[PDB]
């Protein structure tokens, strides 16, 4: 059901997604251990993910949340990095994509900082790094992140380190 449409680097949509990626890089407290050492990315491709069944599933749930929260979905665009990115784009997010040991319990995690999601592309803690070189700081191998539409509704605010 999923088709991927390549965006041109000339398209304003490509450019606005690239800018969110690059401008939300930060330094991490692990000194680069999980995600590598970098201040910016080389963007190679941006594709739009189109799947009508998955979209209608999302909009159905969004309307439910919206009606439970004074007609406010509280929708955000957020990053997600995962070894399961191929499953997610074809079958949607589900319980198999949860961070069982995350600090806010077993759910599906998203970040405003692209560099935070980058830490999970090869697994929790960066896993063993890229499959080819076993390097969490590989500058050669191609990585993939999702930029996702997320319905927060009424969100429980946890102050935390």
């Amino acid at each position: 059901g999923t088709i991927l449409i390549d965006l041109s680097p000339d398209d304003k949509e490509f450019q606005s997604v690239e800018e969110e990626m690059q401008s939300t890089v930060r330094e991490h407290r692990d000194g680069g251990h999980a995600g590598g050492i970098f201040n910016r990315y080389n963007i190679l491709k941006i594709q739009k993910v189109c799947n009508k069944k998955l979209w209608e599933r999302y909009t159905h749930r969004r309307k439910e949340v919206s009606e439970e929260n004074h007609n406010h979905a509280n929708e955000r665009m957020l990053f997600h990095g995962s070894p399961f990115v191929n499953a997610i784009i074809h079958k949607g997010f589900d319980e198999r994509h949860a961070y069982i040991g995350g600090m806010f319990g077993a759910g599906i995690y998203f970040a405003e900082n692209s560099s935070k999601s980058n830490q999970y592309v090869y697994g929790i803690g960066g896993g063993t790094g890229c499959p080819v070189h076993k390097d969490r700081s590989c500058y050669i191998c191609h990585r993939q992140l999702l930029f996702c539409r997320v319905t927060l509704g009424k969100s429980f605010l946890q102050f935390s380190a």
Binding site: V17, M21, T24, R26, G35, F38, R40, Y41, N42, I43, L44, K45, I46, Q47, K48, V49, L54, R57, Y58, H60, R61, R62, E68, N69, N74, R76, M77, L78, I88, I89, G92, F93, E95, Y99, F104, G105, G107, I108, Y109, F110, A111, E112, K116, S137, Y139, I140, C141, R143, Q144, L146, F147, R149, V150, L152, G153, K154, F156, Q158, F159, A161
Partner: protein, 47 residues
């Protein structure tokens, strides 16, 4: 998967130590996210 806290649809993790960190968020239903863009990239070695 766990449940969201009663009366809520997600959790926001507000950073309270690292002044430069942005927020992180957790949802407990797969249907509350759509994977809209797939971005292919490399990290770049600082000069």
């Amino acid at each position: 998967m766990a449940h969201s806290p009663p009366g809520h649809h997600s959790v926001t993790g507000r950073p309270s130590v690292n002044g430069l960190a942005l927020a992180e968020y957790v949802i407990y239903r797969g249907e509350q996210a759509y994977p809209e863009y797939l971005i292919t990239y490399q990290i770049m070695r600082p000069e």
